Write a protein that binds this ligand. Structure first.
Ligand SMILES: CC(=O)c1ccc(C)cc1N[C@H](C(N)=O)c1c(Cl)cccc1Cl
Lengths: 526, 410
């Protein structure tokens, strides 16, 4: 192609490769020569001369429909010495972010790397030797002139060059959408068939204007396209079908891969559950260990097979519409959401179960959920969704007022889909007149004479500080005044959790919900 | 074009390779129109896959303006650029600026585009306009002139600036003009009406010399410290006194002359939290003495230019916040309070608080402080640009505020 070369340099502080070619069987040597001659004859490579100390090893091996070999060049060493490049396309488009096309075609770009020129002052390091089999005979020296396969900079120079070529065509043809992904080219439009097929051939022309090869009609591939675990139709997308086998014996490995698939499937399948399947993993000693399906793991596995029976698909994005996001509580610490623009016509779906912290409550957790979705919305659609939450403005407001952390959540409307998130308890703001006062240290003493001591060795210093509080809660009436010296306990109770992975903490939370009024206070230790 | 002063990275260092945090569509659009214009005048140039560096970019809005402003986060580059000493003055700090009845802040960021950037340096200024849903790897550019927000910038323009600031510096030497980054600070004690016009001049006096100029209008003279407070009750309860003894013993970490012995004796015994303690003579006096000690900032604490300025903020509630600037824990150089009744939103109030504490650290020490922010990164990273108006970006860290350390300030 008549295109401008990209300047390349080796990592600083090092020289090019000076690697020993491997002895080559006379027959594979014959082949290297037929490959290399035809190429010098295409200007891809070119014969150099001595004391050019550079060298990378080659060899041959063939595959399908032929008695001719494929040439391979070992660039791991040049690759090591070569500078880095800007991340050859880093991010992966999510199907839900595309607008629907009417017709879509995928052009396969062959040997394109060979159609792009390598920076002239670097071809020098791409040298390699083709040994002739006779004693005091040749041993032909060559260097590359186009982009070599498996070289560090090829994927990025090509893409960049391609982007340059396709430019006027996109300018001249703003209707059509072209997406470059490695060797493939998805070209889609809203044109009527005949019209669409014509543009395609206009494009194939433009690419040949610079030496690029593509396949015409009969050799092209048609939708659906299975790309990156997805299935893509011009007007709808979905995840590649998921197989839920039937078996009696399930190893640990089996269950992991199955939890793997179930999660992938949840980006469109609303309702997938894996809590029970995951529990099976507890305390396993080997990948090959078989685990008996608990009665609940069975139910779950069964309901899962049901959801996957019915095939759902995702709709594509309509820029002329608002993005609505909806979240529901699916179990303790489990949330689900659906993103759609048209009621019940989901662009995307998801679950959230991030335990940020050892202890939390539902309001803090909904808030974190709303953050994830937001970041997700921005990356896929460039805008935030308008949220529908099952929590009253006054519950939300009431907690973030008293919480020490700053936070903020976009525009949401209250949706009455139980279970609704509520604050289970509220610690008092001022002490209670006439409620007994428990002074804790494990033990306590009250202003009414009461007392108790307890001995526990199987503890941590934190656990005892919490034990004592529990005891006070346990023995007190419906209104209590508790005083502790523990900064830790106060921090925990003060944040008002409703769930924890600490047993002790879950028992205390229970006491907390039964009480009428509770005031917790702190004082220095000695 | 004119001649470049050669710039280098600290020996051993490589260029920055920072990730762009995702931007909303409206934002990428703004930046696309801005960069195309800059591209046509030749300030920025499109680059190839062979440049592996990156600095993040943002689009922020203006006050009483419909115009967007491109903002570049050069923090990593600025930490890696050669130490800047200028063979002219070394641009010290006007200890006097802080004593000024009035200080006006001007953006002179634009002066920077009339000067070319050392050629071999340009590559390090690589930035990326990201594309939605990752369709492309983004639109990549680098700078050809002095970027706004880089530290070498005002360093290199350091001379043409004094040259433009000569008629003025002597046509009225009652004015103190300090320059920090892309900003200009004009101070004086003139009567508010005449001050406001002496700035109009400077502006006009600048266009005609080689630049254009567009913010704040502060008064450093009425800025003060918020000292630690003690409640003053009609009648004390056990709770009141327990809170008092607790606050007091935290405070004695800073002022050692603080006693609580008598207070503590009125509180020995498993008394009920609501029992009202009528105060003893010795405890009344011990309190009276404690208040007195708390009336002023602790003695002998000094600003050391060799150390970093740290700023901590605390959410107090109802649209209220408290902060402290220090270099050593307890050894506070300043403390203050910020309010906007509670309404607008947490992230907004916090961003406004950060911009104000930074402006003040500059006016006073000529340095920006490192903040400790009470917020989760993802929320801050998502919204700060929505409200940001400044042209610099201080460094920040995200923390967890203790409930006690919090109320020990109000
Ligand atoms: C970002 C993008 O447009 C894209 C990314 C991955 C794939 C497989 C196809 C893509 N575009 C194609 C396309 N260029 O037509 C596409 C669109 Cl735009 C809509 C529906 C299906 C398909 Cl295949």
């Amino acid at each position: 192609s008549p295109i401008e070369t990209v300047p390349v340099k080796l990592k600083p502080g090092m020289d090019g490769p000076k690697v020993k070619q491997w002895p080559l069987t006379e027959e594979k040597i014959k082949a290297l020569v037929e490959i290399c001659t035809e190429m010098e004859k295409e200007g891809k490579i070119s014969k150099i001369g001595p004391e050019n100390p550079y060298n990378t090893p080659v060899f041959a091996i063939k595959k399908k429909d032929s008695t001719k070999w494929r040439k391979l060049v070992d660039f791991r060493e040049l690759n090591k010495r070569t500078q880095d490049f800007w991340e050859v396309q880093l991010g992966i488009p999510h199907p839900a972010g595309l607008k629907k096309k009417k017709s879509v075609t995928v052009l396969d770009v062959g040997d394109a790397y060979f159609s792009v020129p390598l920076d002239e002052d670097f071809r020098k390091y791409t040298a390699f030797t083709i040994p002739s089999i006779n004693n005091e005979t040749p041993g032909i020296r060559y260097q590359y002139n186009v982009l070599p396969q498996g070289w560090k900079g090829s994927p990025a120079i090509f893409q960049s060059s391609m982007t340059k070529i396709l430019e006027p065509f996109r300018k001249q043809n703003p209707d059509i959408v072209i997406y470059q992904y490695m060797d493939d080219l998805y070209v889609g439009s809203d044109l009527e068939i005949g019209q669409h097929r014509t543009k395609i051939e206009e494009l194939r022309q433009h690419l040949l204007r610079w030496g690029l090869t593509t396949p015409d009609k009969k050799h092209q591939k048609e939708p659906p396209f299975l790309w990156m675990g997805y299935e893509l139709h011009p007007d709808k997308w979905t995840v590649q079908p998921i197989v839920l086998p039937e078996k009696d014996s399930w190893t640990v490995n089996d269950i992991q891969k199955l939890v793997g698939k179930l999660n992938w499937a949840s980006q469109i399948y609303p309702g997938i559950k894996v809590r029970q399947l995951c529990k099976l993993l507890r305390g396993t000693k080997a990948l090959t260990e078989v685990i008996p399906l608990t009665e609940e793991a069975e139910l779950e596995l069964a309901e899962n097979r049901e959801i996957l029976k019915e095939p759902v698909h995702g709709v594509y994005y309509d820029p002329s519409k608002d993005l609505i996001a909806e979240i529901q509580k699916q179990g303790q610490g489990q949330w689900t959401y659906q993103i759609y623009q048209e009621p019940f016509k989901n662009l995307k779906t998801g679950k959230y179960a991030r335990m940020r912290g050892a202890h939390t409550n539902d309001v803090k957790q909904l808030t974190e959920a709303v953050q994830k979705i937001t970041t997700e919305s921005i990356v896929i659609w460039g805008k935030t969704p308008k949220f529908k939450l099952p929590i009253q403005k006054e519950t939300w407001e009431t907690w973030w007022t008293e919480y020490w952390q700053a936070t903020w959540i976009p525009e949401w409307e209250f949706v009455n889909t139980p279970p609704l998130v509520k604050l289970w308890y509220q610690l008092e703001k001022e002490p209670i007149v006439g409620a007994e006062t428990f002074y804790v240290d494990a033990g306590y003493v009250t202003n009414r004479g009461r007392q108790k001591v307890v001995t526990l060795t199987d503890t941590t210093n934190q656990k005892t500080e919490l034990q004592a509080i529990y005891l006070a809660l346990q023995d007190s009436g419906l209104e209590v005044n508790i005083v502790t010296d523990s900064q830790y306990a106060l921090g925990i109770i003060q944040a008002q959790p409703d769930q924890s992975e600490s047993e002790l903490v879950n028992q205390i939370i229970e006491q907390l919900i039964k009480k009428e009024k509770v005031y917790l206070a702190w004082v220095p230790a000695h | 074009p004119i001649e470049t002063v050669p710039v280098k990275l600290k020996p051993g260092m490589d260029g920055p390779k920072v990730k762009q945090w995702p931007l909303t569509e409206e934002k990428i659009k703004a930046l696309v129109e801005i960069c195309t214009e800059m591209e046509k005048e030749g300030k920025i140039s499109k680059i190839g896959p062979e440049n592996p560096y990156n600095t993040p970019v943002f689009a922020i809005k203006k006050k009483d303006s419909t115009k967007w402003r491109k903002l570049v986060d050069f923090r990593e580059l600025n930490k890696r650029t050669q130490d800047f000493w200028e063979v002219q003055l070394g641009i010290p700090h006007p200890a006097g600026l802080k004593k000024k009845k009035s200080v006006t802040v001007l953006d002179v960021g634009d002066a920077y585009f009339s000067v070319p950037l050392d050629e071999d340096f340009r590559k390090y200024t690589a930035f990326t306009i990201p594309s939605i849903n990752n369709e492309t790897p983004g639109i990549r550019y680098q700078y050809n002139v002095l970027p706004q927000g880089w530290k070498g910038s005002p360093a290199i323009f350091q001379s043409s600036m004094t040259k433009i600031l000569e008629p003025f510096r002597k046509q009225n030497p009652d004015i103190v003009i300090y320059q920090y980054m892309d900003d200009l600070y004009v101070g004086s004690d003139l009567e508010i009406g005449q001050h406001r016009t002496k700035i109009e001049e400077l502006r006009q006096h600048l266009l005609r010399w080689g630049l254009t100029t567009p913010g704040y209008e502060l008064h450093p003279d009425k800025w003060t410290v918020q000292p630690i407070v003690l409640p003053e009750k009609d009648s004390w309860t056990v709770n009141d006194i327990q809170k008092l003894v607790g606050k007091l013993n935290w405070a004695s970490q800073i002022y050692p002359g603080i006693k609580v012995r008598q207070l503590c004796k009125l509180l020995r015994g498993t008394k009920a939290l609501t029992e009202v303690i009528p105060l003893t003579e010795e405890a009344e006096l011990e309190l009276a003495e404690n208040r007195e000690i708390l009336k002023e900032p602790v003695h002998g604490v000094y600003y050391d230019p060799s150390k970093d300025l740290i700023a901590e903020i605390q959410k107090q509630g109802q649209g209220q916040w408290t902060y402290q600037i220090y270099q050593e824990p307890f050894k506070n150089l300043k403390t203050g309070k910020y309010a906007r009744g509670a309404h607008t939103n947490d992230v907004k109030q916090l961003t406004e608080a950060v911009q104000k504490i930074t402006t003040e650290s500059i006016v006073i020490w000529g340095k920006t402080p490192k903040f400790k922010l009470p917020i989760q990164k993802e929320t801050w990273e998502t919204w700060w640009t929505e409200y940001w108006q400044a042209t610099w970006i201080p460094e920040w860290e995200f923390v967890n505020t203790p409930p006690l350390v919090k109320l020990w300030y109000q």
